[PDB]
Curated annotation (Swiss-Prot):
This is Endo-1,4-beta-xylanase A. Does not require any standard metal (Mg(2+), Mn2(+), Ca(2+)). Completely inhibited by Hg(2+), unaffected by EDTA. Optimum temperature is 60 degrees Celsius, more than 80% of activity remains after 1 hour at 60 degrees Celsius. Coiled coil: none annotated. Contributes to hydrolysis of hemicellulose, the major component of plant cell-walls. Hydrolyzes xylan to xylose and xylobiose. Keywords: Carbohydrate metabolism, Glycosidase, Hydrolase, Polysaccharide degradation, Signal, Xylan degradation. Its EC number is 3.2.1.8. Belongs to the glycosyl hydrolase 10 (cellulase F) family. Residues 2-311 form the GH10 domain. Optimum pH is 6.5, more than 80% active between pH 5.0 and 7.0. GO terms for biological process: xylan catabolic process. The keyword Transferase does not apply. The chain holds residues 39 to 351 of 464 of the full protein.
Amino acid sequence: DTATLGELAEAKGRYFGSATDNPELPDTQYTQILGSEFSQITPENTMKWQYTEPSRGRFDYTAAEEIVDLAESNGQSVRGHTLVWHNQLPSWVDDVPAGELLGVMRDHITHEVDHFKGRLIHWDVVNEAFEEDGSRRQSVFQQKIGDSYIAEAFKAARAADPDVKLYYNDYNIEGIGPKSDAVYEMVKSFKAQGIPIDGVGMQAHLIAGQVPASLQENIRRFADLGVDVALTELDIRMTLPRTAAKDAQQATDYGAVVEACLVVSRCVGITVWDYTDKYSWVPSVFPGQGAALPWDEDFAKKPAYHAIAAALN
Ligand SMILES: [Zn+2]
Ligand SMILES: [Zn+2]
Ligand SMILES: [Zn+2]
Ligand SMILES: [Zn+2]
Ligand SMILES: [Zn+2]
Ligand SMILES: [Zn+2]
Ligand SMILES: [Zn+2]
């Protein structure tokens, strides 16, 4: 036949998906590949707080519902993203009296998780809670609720949907270091205390030629703690413009990343943060960098695609 990345991954008990956003759905060529090549989908924005609860106590899931429906139409699983995060938070949240924030956070989590109960395989419950040195990011939740907010978020999520996998998500935690160590200690602490948590999501926003050599050992140590691991927002940015050499290095990196996951039985899957450079978020956030995805702006498969398919075997 000629298997797709999704089919190759599923053949080995894993999923290979892509994130997507509502503004992209009109792109026929884009949605065609999206629906056939991948086995999993992650809504890029519309499940975030700024969209789901734009005003206190008033919820809105219509936009996110469209992505979920699309995924279901193609027989693709869906990862919820994300419940608690310091970015893309409506302004009213900062005005909530400190003593009421915990209740508000739980409520937000309860409504959204309950609404999508039974339709998602995972939920990125808390996103980017740590600084590069391992200390806690001083978000409104950390400052007004305290260290326990993460644990409380996971408890609230579990209470609203007992079957969905609860994930802690963050970037720059692919290699063994200060940041991943902090996440490691938190997960270890959670397991010992009985705090529900089913997996760690490594966003994996990597830089070409700079993939952490300890990636595999890092994925395994988390797996050994009793949690699944998933590469949730994979992309490997390079300094523009691209060249044959840069594309080749990128391909080697994608291959290495994929095989590292296939080596650890509890690494359940990989999701690229969208699949074509045409819509990559990279250029707008990392000046001078881009071309971080397997498909270029004209939907041509890059050498990176070859490496991924080869790794998936
Ligand atoms: Zn086919
Ligand atoms: Zn996108
Ligand atoms: Zn609406
Ligand atoms: Zn629907
Ligand atoms: Zn260490
Ligand atoms: Zn091209
Ligand atoms: Zn090829």
